[PDB]
Structure formats: C-alpha cells, structure tokens
C-alpha cells in the first residue's frame, strides 16, 4: 500500500533536471545561519523551522478537514502570481464560511516572511485556514498556518520533459459540486487517493476522475487540458479552477489558439491531439498515454512543449504576475 | 458563520445532566496529581497532556485527510465495546489502504492508558490512524502516524436534549459524500458535506440535518446515525452510512424488546410516516427527534421506544456484560 | 392522479389569446371537405387523419422508448427553423443510433406535406423515428431498414396558455425528483422518456404551482417538463449547457437578446442564481417565450413580467410574420 | 447500428432447444383457421391478430413512456406465476400514478384470453397501463388510461442453447442505471435509454450483454433481467435501482430450499469479481449462467453447479402442480 502522490521535492533543495530544458534551479548557497533556513513555517504568532512545525491534534482543520488553503511558488526567486493565489484563498474560505483572521495583506507579508526566512529560491508556499480548535489563549477562532518548503513535483522535472501515462479511474468519482465542492481547494483526498490506487494498480502514474454525470474532472492536485484541432479545453464543473490552468489559457490564446471552458467527455479525450496537466507543483506536463492507448503521436504535444517553454520563461521575464522576493 | 456540531463537554469535565433520569455522571473529585488529569493524549510514542498534543503540519492526515479513526467512550471508568470499536478501526484503515502501525492489542492500550492517565470516569476516547508525514525521525518502516486521546465526554445533543429531543431538516442544499468517493462506511474527517448541512439547519431554524445520497434516500447526519420506528420495526440506513456502533447496541436492544429491524433503504417518506425518529452516536447516545422539517414525528414528544432504548442504553454501562471493561485508575 | 402537462390547444384549432398583445391566430374558415383538414399524419407511407394516427403497439419506439423527435411549429402559414429542427433531430437520431430511414429533404417535404393537407395555419408539427417492429411488411430484403418515420400536423399546442404568455406562471424548484443524467439517457436527445418529467410536475401540483424546474445530480439547475429555463441578471442571459435539449426557441432567444446588446451564457446555472435573477422565463416551441414571476413561493424580481422578457417574447412572435431565412411559407 | 436485445422468439413459434436438457417446447400442431392463432393482443376493448395491434400514436405511453408493465409466460399451456405479475403490475402502476381501468380480476382474464385465442402452449404475454390519449370514444368521470395485452410466442433474451452453455457479460462503464429518484428502475417500464446504450456498449466490447451501475457504483441489473450471484453458499443480488423480478423471487426461493443463504442487498463489482457463480434471471428465457465477465472467467468458466440446479428447478416447476402453474383453457 505504498502510495505516490508527488515524485520529487520532498526532502531534496534541488532535483535533478534535464539540462538544456526550459526548467533550471537557481546555483546559489544557501546561508544556513538561521534555524529558519531550508523551511520556514507560520503558526500561531511564530515564525519557526519546518521541522518544527506542528498544529494542535484538536483544530478541526484536521478532525473535520474545516480548512481550505492555496500554494503558491517562488522560482527564481520570484512569487509567481501571489496575488491571484491569495485572491483565490480568501474566495473559497468566504464559500466555506470559514472566517479569515488576517487581511488579504497580512497574508501576502506572512506568505513573503516565510520565504525570505527560508532563503529558499524554490519554494512551495502553502497558507492554508482551519475553523480552528476553539478559543484562542488570549474574537476569531480560526487558524492560519503558513509553510515555504523546497519545490514540489507531482511530476518530476525529467517528467515534466518526457511525459506521463495516465488512466481514466473507473473505480472512483470525483466529490460532487453538492457533497463538497472542488471549486474550493480543500484537504479532502479520499477520492483522489483512491484514483491514484487505481491508476498505480493498472500500471499508470496517475488517474482522470470522472463525475456523476460521466465527465472529465481534474486529477490528484492538477488539473486536466487537451488541445484539438486549434482549441484547448477544460472542465469548468467538479474542478478547481487552477491558476496554472489560468496562464496556460492565457499562453493559449497568445499563441492564437482558441479556449474552451466547460464539460469535457472521454470520448473528447480520446481524440484529443494532445493532453496535459496544470498544477503549481511542477507546472505544465505532458500526458502521453491515456488508458494505455497513445494520446495523439504517443510524444509530447507541440503545443504543450511550447506552453510549457513560455510558462517556465514566464518566470524571469519582469511582468505584473512575477515578484521578487527580498532575501 | 458560527457553527454548532457539538453542544456539551468542550472544555467541561461534567456537564448538566437532568435529575432523576437515567444520564448521571460520576460523582468524584478529579485527582490532579498528574499533568495528563483531565486529558491525555499518545502522539509519536509519548503520553502528553492533552492541551499540549500537537501534530506534524505535514501530516498527510491534515493535508490530504488521509486518516481513518474511532471513538469509543467511557462512562462510569467503564469502557463501552472496546474491542468493537478497535476491530471497526480496524477494517476502515485495510479498506482505506492505511497501514497499521501498531497492533489490536497495542491500539487498546494506547486507549485504556490515556483513559487512565486522564482520570476521567466519562470519557470521549479517539484513536485515529494516518498516512504520516513520511520516514519517521530516526528511522524502511511504516510512515502510518497512530494518534489517540482522551478528553471529558463530548455531547453532539446536550444531555438535556437527549431527554426533551432535537428537531431536524431533511438537507436539500447538500449531499452525502458517494460510497463511489470517499464511503461513509469508512469513518473519516472529511466533513465538508457535514459542516454544509449544519449551516443548512442552522440557516432554517433547526438543530441538525439529515442528509440524502444521491439517490433520494436517507443516509445520516453530523456525526450520528439516523433511525426510525413505524408499527414495530426499527429501520435504518444501510448504505452511504457510517455502521454505528451506537446503532448496532440501539438494534440490539430493539430486538430484545420485541422489535422488528431492517437494516436497508430509508425513504424521506418513510421518515414523514414515522411514528418515532432518533439519532445514535457515541458522543452522547440516544437522542429523540421530536420534529422533522418543522412537523412533530408522531405525538411530537419522545416516543415510547426511543425512551426505553435510551434508557437501557444508559443502565447498560453499569452492567457487567462483554461489552463493558472496567479502565484501572 | 391528474396531470397537467399541457395547458392549450388540443382539439381546439383557435385558442383564445390577449386583445392587443403580439400572439393572435390567422383569422379564416377551414375547408373540411378532405379528411385530413384539422390534422394530418403521415405513418408507413400514407398521409391519414390525425384522429386515426395508430402505430404498431410492437414498435420498439413504445416498448423500449427506442426513439427520438422534433416539434416545429407554424404560425400564420409560416414554418418556423424546419431546417434547424430537421438537423437537429438528424444529429439526435444519429447519437442515439437509430438509422434515418429518409433524408433531410424527404422529412421536411413530409412536414410540409402534413401542414398543407391538414390546412392549419397555426400548427404543431412532431416528427419521430423509431428503432421499429422489424422488418417491414413486403420485407425489403434484410438490408433495409427497420426504422419508422411517424410525421404529424395538429394544432398548434400551448404547454402555457396564450394569457400566460403574457400574464406569467409560477414554478417550484423539483425536490422529490431530479433530471435524467447524460450517461443514463442524454437531455440533449429530444426523447419520450418522461418519467421524471411527470414526477416534477406532479410534484408541481402537489405543491401548487404551474410547474417545476428540475435540478440534475451536482444541484443544478436543468429544464423542466417540455421547455427549457432562461434567466436574466445585470445585463446577461444565463441557461444550462448540461442535462438539458438544446432548443431551438431557447436558441431563438438567445439571437434575440444579444441583438438587444444583452451578454449570454450557456454554463451551469445554480439555484442561488435563480433565486437572486431579475427575470426567468421559460422557452419551448409548444408556446414561445413564458415570463416566470414566482418561484418557490417567492416573487422573482418585482414580480411581474420583466423588462427584457417582455422585448424577447414580443420580438419573437414579431419573427413569424418577418420575411428571413427563419420562415418558410407552406404552400396550402 | 444493428442492435440486439432478444436473441430468438420474435417470429418463430418453436426455437431449437438442447436436446435432453430441462427446456423442451410443447409438441403440437397449431390451427391457423382463426387469424388470432399464433399471437392475440386487447387493444381498446378488441381481440385483434398480432400485427394488427396498434395504438393511438397521440397515447402518451408513447410520447411520454408514460406507462408500465408486467410480462408474465406461459410453458406447457401452464400461466406461471400470473397472480404474482397482476399484483407486481398493478403496484407499480399505483407508484406511478397511473389509475388502473380494469380490475385484478379482468386483467388476468384478458390475458388468459389473449393466449387462449393465441392457441400458443409457449408464450410472452405482456400487459402494460397507459396514461392514455384523452378521452376515450363514447363524462370526464372515465378513466383515460389504457390498458394493452398481447400473447406472442415465447421470447428469449439469451437463446435456449445459451440459456444451457452460459453467456459472457460486461460491467457497463459507458452509462449508469436510471436512478431511483429520476425513473425507478422498482417500476417495470419502458424507457430503455440506457440499457439500449448498455447492450451497444457491450456489443462494442465483444460481450452478449452488459451490466449496469447506479451513481455509486453498485450492480444492479442488465437489459431485461436480474443479476444474481452465489459466494460461499450465499446467493446475492441487488436491492436498489433494480426490478424485482419474479424470476429473481423463485431463484431465491429454490435456492432457499437448497439450504443456501440469500441477500437481497448491495451488490459491488469487487463482490462479482469474486463470485463462484454469476447467472441472470428473467421471464424472457429463465435463468442464464454468466460464465464470463470484463473477459475474465466467472469462477471455474463454466455454468455452476448451484445454477443448473436452480436452472434446472426452475423448468420442472413448470410442469409440478402447485399454486404457481395455471393451466390455461384452450
Ligand atoms: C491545486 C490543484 C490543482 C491545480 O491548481 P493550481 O492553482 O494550478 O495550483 C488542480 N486540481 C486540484 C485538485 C488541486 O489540488
Ligand atoms: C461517529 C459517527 C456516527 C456514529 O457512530 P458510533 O459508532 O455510534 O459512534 C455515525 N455517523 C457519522 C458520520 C459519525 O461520524
Ligand atoms: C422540446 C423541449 C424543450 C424545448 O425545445 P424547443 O426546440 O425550443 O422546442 C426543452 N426541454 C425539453 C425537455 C423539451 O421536451
Ligand atoms: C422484466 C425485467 C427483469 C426481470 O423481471 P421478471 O419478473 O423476472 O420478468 C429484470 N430487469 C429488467 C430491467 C426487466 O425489464
């Protein structure tokens, strides 16, 4: 019963990468003067190393998974998109009727604390707000909690390059929009580690959900986009709406493609040119095998090898979506 | 955006009880001796007093809710259907494909010495088992984190209430979470359809909520089981539901005093036709629903039945019996 | 147990409507001298009087509802969409798997061969194909086709009557029933299969309102029994993309509201937009276009029929007399 | 598009059978002097041939499927089991909210009728109840509800030969079940969008048939018929999102009398998967070994022991006086 959500970052400052590829990690040393150094976490009023980082067993963050969170990432050194990430947060916390003990900018200062703490120029920053366990010592009840760890990749960087191989789960369905809502990104995987069973169970990395109705949701932490005949699609229902989806769109459409927001079949899938996923852990990553069949040529798609080129260049070119982070 | 899942025992060691009735805690004076008086916990291999007990951020049990666990209560320093309780723990972690870092034997020790060490004779004792936050420290072995505490008993109905009853609404903007997504069979933290149908109650004036399946039929509420009584047979949920242990006592002692049981498909109808409705859970018992979507279940008063189940439910942890181990202090 | 899915128009060929208002009947006399004026269909072959329209009760279309359609109508003489209708069905048959056995022209020549026959100049006009009975009488050589056309002309049926088009109806969110999913049998293919639709409008009357708008199993809104749900708010017309039949009237309305300068948006609609909407109305081909002014027992808007549905109804009506590529004159 | 629902019976009176094995055909010769020989049907008061059946098309059994039914057969000139039909028909037509305009009593009269006028000793009689085309020729007191019948040879989803040799069968992923709170599946009735796509589906695949599953992924039934399982001495088959079939109810009930334990309850794919013994039930052909399922064998791949002796039970009861054999009056 061993399980793989994420293949590489978990405990590892720089991951191999392939060399001359679009995907790099900054050559820097990393001062390791403060214990904050490496992984830097936010809880309760501190700041405090990662390996340090622990929540009270009572918050029902935990025993009702009453939380919601986004992650943001620094590449380069610079935020990517940090704004939209935390506009995102608050949205589907005010859906979840969690109320927010912070503003919009405490959390953007609390998000850049904890990377410039970590040193870190590569970093997953996860913020994430529970219901909380009661009152606090010291009136809001719920918890922000914060952490900037090393990268992250659901698929590895050499992945990221080569591709992936994937199955439509038929043993398991995405959590419908009426039970709780993909919209909002929440903590409750019980579908999602099963598809990803499934998937390893049938000799594939990784699995496409289903829901109730037969259409094509996202997968275990990113979501699902295909290019056909001059046009990307994507589900709009039983999906979070990625912001990495978001900039592929937008790549998309620079690129004179048409976008398309909304159901998606398996039958679409299977005649699909291409496919690939979106996530902020590893970016944009080629899908080619589906349910063992080839998708399009059975290589990366053309049109995924130059999103995802753009998307990584995307991450030194000075723009209103990069911020760079005071170390 | 308040919200209501539990009414009594948060940070109360004895809370009211109505006199004369069949809800009666211990009389005694909490030995204090010990920093774990009041509420201990096991976590990563100490026991801690409980508002110390913390665990890993990077639990995947917090970030992916990828955890399975139990309660089981004590009352009167009686454990009720211990063994039960670790065995149903244990058939959810194998079916949820966590790997058990401990044994049924270490499990219920864990469990009778955090109860010990806490003093309480009425007691909320969970134990939960999770994915972990990858190779423990020093440690290739088990990452499964095992996590078990006991705090003062908790009550989702205040002991008043499960004397006088609750009312309810049948939710109509939120389903249960499918078998086919994550089962209800499995007793998890994913709450998110849970906490929607309490604010849904909340919202129309009501206690809790019972929720459907997708479907049409009725499952079960905010941390409780739903039953129903109608001409001599007590139905209940099979399907897209916890089985409560909580339950499993009610249907015993249904059936040792002379009534029918079905467990099966449940039908809003059926519920309306009702002669009596009740809730079952460990944290608190048996608890009377006296009004469904703003109508009296039958006369509208605790029925006949749910009150003699309710009460031998409670008269059932002073009675010596299998399903009763007395906890050393 | 009584059922109301139609409010108007059988055996009635002029229903009365609002003086003054933009739906009034053409005003003539019917020559009945042939047996087919009043109602005309066409089965296996031969054009028959509406009133004597029976089919084979082994036709796969009844036993297994192996079978898919269109309703066009006529008004004042002119067809509205044949064209559309006509491809459309066509895609509906071939995504259910059922073999056309005619050709687009052929179908619509025995569309216009039912109105002309039957001389209604305000019709309902159903054209269906079934998986059949087998092999048809005088066989045709295992290779044929075992499929049925089944054409008729009658007239013209209202699911709400000409004074509610103007007036408005009241509608429930459906609670004890929910639309037939995409993978069960696809909303998209004009079908038989009502056996939900019934349910919410029995659902409907029980709770005393018109009708029922159903919800489909994530929670949103989908059609209802026989006409698809528009709703209007700050300047955009939204209406479900999943679990419903694509209309041709919701199509029509759709034209209409961006040639007003209005947004649309075909995308999953909740209840909670609804509830917040400044208008709904409803749009079927079986009475044009319905302003909705309560919905669960409460005033939709301020209540009365909205602004914008006002100019869609009126400009909709205004296109069965407007010489386009919309209309096509029967030849009687 | 060629589709596939009934394997034999549809315009023959006699289908070969195995030879020696429990299904044997009447031996006889049938008059063909009255037109009604060899297929009667009621339509609107009238005894009337078979392919002259026909209804209103404005009948919204039609353009509304609203309508339901009940198939009941008769084997060796006996009824089986009408009374059990009559009284499921009727049920479901009351759930439906269909108001019935005959009583038991006449229903079952006409469709003794149909078949004797039928002269067939092996029939399919159906009769279904429709929501009706309006008024009926001749007060708004009167019911508009039409009641059909029809008696027609004998029809096998799966043929004799397959109803001894066993038939290979997938779990459908390309379409669910009706659900319940849509159009139960409880309520025999004629809306077959899905278990049409199903039967395409399995075709696609290679397989006889398909079984379908509801929105949270249990079994439930296939196209016509119920399916049921045996593991370790108990037989198992779906509660919900499925007809109750009365050839599933005698199932249970021989299997009863053999000792085996039965669960009428939640059945999943994993269940199926490791079953010992898969067979389909219906009044159209009887019990059917499923000897293969997903391309996988079904236990040891051949028809099991507990399903032929059922199998077998089951046709020998249609000769055993006894309250379920009725014989009819030619
Ligand atoms: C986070 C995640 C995604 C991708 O969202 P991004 O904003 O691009 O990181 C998609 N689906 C799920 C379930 C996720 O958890
Ligand atoms: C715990 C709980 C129950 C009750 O189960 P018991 O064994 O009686 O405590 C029922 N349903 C849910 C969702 C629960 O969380
Ligand atoms: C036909 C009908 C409609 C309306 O479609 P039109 O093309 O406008 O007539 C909408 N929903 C259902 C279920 C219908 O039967
Ligand atoms: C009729 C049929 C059955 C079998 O029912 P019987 O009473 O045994 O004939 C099972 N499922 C479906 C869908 C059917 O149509």
């Not at 709406?241 to 937008?250: D, H, Q, S």
Request: net charge negative; glycine share 10%; charged share 20%.
């Amino acid at each position: 019963n061993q399980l793989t959500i994420l293949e590489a970052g978990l405990d590892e400052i720089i991951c191999e990468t392939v060399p001359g590829e679009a995907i790099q990690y900054s050559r820097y040393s990393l001062d390791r003067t403060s214990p904050l150094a490496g992984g830097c976490a936010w809880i309760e009023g501190a700041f405090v190393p990662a390996a340090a980082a622990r929540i009270s067993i009572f918050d029902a963050g935990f025993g009702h998974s009453d939380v919601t969170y986004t992650v943001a990432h620094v590449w380069h050194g610079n935020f990517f998109r940090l704004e939209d990430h935390v506009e995102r947060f608050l949205a589907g916390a005010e859906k979840m009727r969690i109320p927010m003990p912070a503003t919009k900018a405490e959390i953007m200062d609390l998000m850049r604390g904890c990377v410039s703490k970590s040193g870190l120029r590569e970093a997953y920053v996860n913020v994430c707000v529970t219901r909380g366990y009661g009152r606090k010592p010291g009136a809001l009840e719920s918890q922000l909690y914060v952490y900037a760890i090393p990268y992250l990749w659901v698929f590895s960087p050499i992945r990221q390059i080569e591709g992936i191989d994937a199955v439509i789960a038929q043993s398991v369905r995405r959590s419908p929009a009426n039970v709780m809502d993909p919209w909002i990104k929440n903590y409750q995987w019980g579908d999602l580690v099963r598809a990803t069973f499934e998937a390893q169970e049938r000799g594939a990395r990784t699995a496409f959900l289903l829901d109730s109705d037969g259409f094509v949701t996202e997968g275990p932490g990113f979501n699902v986009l295909m290019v056909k005949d001059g046009t990307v699609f994507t589900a709009a229902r039983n999906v979070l709406p990625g912001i990495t989806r978001r900039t592929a769109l937008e790549i998309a459409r620079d690129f004179g493609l048409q976008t398309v927001i909304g159901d998606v079949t398996p039958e679409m899938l299977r005649g699909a040119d291409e496919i690939f996923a979106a996530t902020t852990a590893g970016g944009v990553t080629p899908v080619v095998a589906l349910d063992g069949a080839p998708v399009g040529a059975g290589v990366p798609g053309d049109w995924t090898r130059k999103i995802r080129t753009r998307y990584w260049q995307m991450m030194d070119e000075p723009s209103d979506l990069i911020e760079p982070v005071s170390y």
